[PDB]
């Protein structure tokens, strides 16, 4: 008890956590096309931290990352910077890129996952002939490759007009959209401003 002469409770059951042999931080990155992503790693060799000079990066165990992207933040941790990222092509079931940081030629099994999915969804809105409701339709062609993904239309209503540069608003409202026979989701705003 925080206030007063409280009595200490019994100790809880001890929890044991065992770590792996190579540290990637952050382990996974969700990003878009054209963004810059920095990955940091610490490599351990027989309970000894390898210096950042020996660390070499590879993409999906296929080709060595050029040393221009290599940066030494500290003597223990190395990092790589990716600029103007393109969409990662799906190689079989895996839709992400596995970036490996290794001690020289010899590499480790663990990696870092880079998910660059296509978020460019075109939404077209259209009002009825009596201007009573507005139906907005959008396609799902670029999102069929990812399972367990939930799609929700979020809209923010301004008091007057549209800004010159649209932006994500922290306060937003969900919209109920229904899939049609043609593969397009339609959401009906009634009444409309």
């Amino acid at each position: 008890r925080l206030d007063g002469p409280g009595i200490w409770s019994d100790w809880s059951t001890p929890r044991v956590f065992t770590t792996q042999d190579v540290i990637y931080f952050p382990p996974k990155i969700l990003t878009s096309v054209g963004s810059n992503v920095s990955f940091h790693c610490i490599y351990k060799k027989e309970n000894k931290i390898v210096p950042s000079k020996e660390i070499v990066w590879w993409m999906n165990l296929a080709e060595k990352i050029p040393q221009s992207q290599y940066d030494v933040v500290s003597d223990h941790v190395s990092k790589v910077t990716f600029f103007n990222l393109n969409e990662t092509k799906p190689r079989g079931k895996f839709t992400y890129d596995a970036v490996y940081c290794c001690n020289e030629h010899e590499c480790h099994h663990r990696y870092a996952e880079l998910y660059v999915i296509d978020v460019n969804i075109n939404i077209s809105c259209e009002t009825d002939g009596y201007l009573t409701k507005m139906t907005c339709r959008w396609s799902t062609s670029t999102i069929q490759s990812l399972a367990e993904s939930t799609l929700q239309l979020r809209y923010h209503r301004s008091s007057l007009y549209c800004s010159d540069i649209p932006s994500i608003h922290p306060i937003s409202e969900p919209k109920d959209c229904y899939l049609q026979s043609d593969g397009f989701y339609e959401c009906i705003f009634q009444p409309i401003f």
């Binding site: 165990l61 190689r91 079989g92 030629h105 590499c107 480790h108 099994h109 663990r110 990696y111």
Partner: protein, 146 residues
């Protein structure tokens, strides 16, 4: 049992499996010879001089492939089984007694790698399988012995 026909069928089966692995795009870009730590248990390129070594190698590969959920891999496992049977009939035609290879007793460790990193295990296992098949095919004319 025609020895020559079995040998030619064995050759064709090997090329077939190699092509199957070729179809798997992610495997092609990965270096077969390159070493990755943790996968060491997988029987990669280390001189496979004899028929008994080939049999145990294929047995281990079948055992590893069986555990991984993939449609292509199941067919590859079946082809490997047929390959082993072909090697056994050839070993019989050569008056050799091949004991039926058990897989690796040491699979209690493979689970960990499959859980932590499926992608690495799959790409390495496939590329090393392709490599092992290629040296086996090279050596099959050299008059392999038991």
């Amino acid at each position: 049992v025609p020895i020559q026909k079995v040998q030619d069928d064995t050759k064709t089966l090997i090329k077939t499996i190699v092509t199957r692995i070729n179809d798997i795009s992610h495997t092609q870009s990965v270096s077969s010879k390159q070493k990755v730590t943790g996968l060491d248990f997988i029987p990669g390129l280390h001189p496979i001089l004899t028929l008994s070594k080939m049999d145990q190698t294929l047995a281990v590969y079948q055992q590893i492939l069986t555990s991984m959920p993939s449609r292509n891999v199941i067919q590859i496992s079946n082809d490997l089984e047929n390959l082993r049977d072909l090697l056994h009939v050839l070993a019989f035609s050569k008056s050799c007694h091949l004991p039926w290879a058990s897989g690796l007793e040491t699979l209690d460790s493979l689970g960990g790698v499959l859980e932590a990193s499926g992608y690495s295990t799959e790409v390495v296992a496939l590329s090393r399988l392709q490599g092992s098949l290629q040296d086996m095919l090279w050596q099959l004319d050299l008059s392999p012995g038991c």
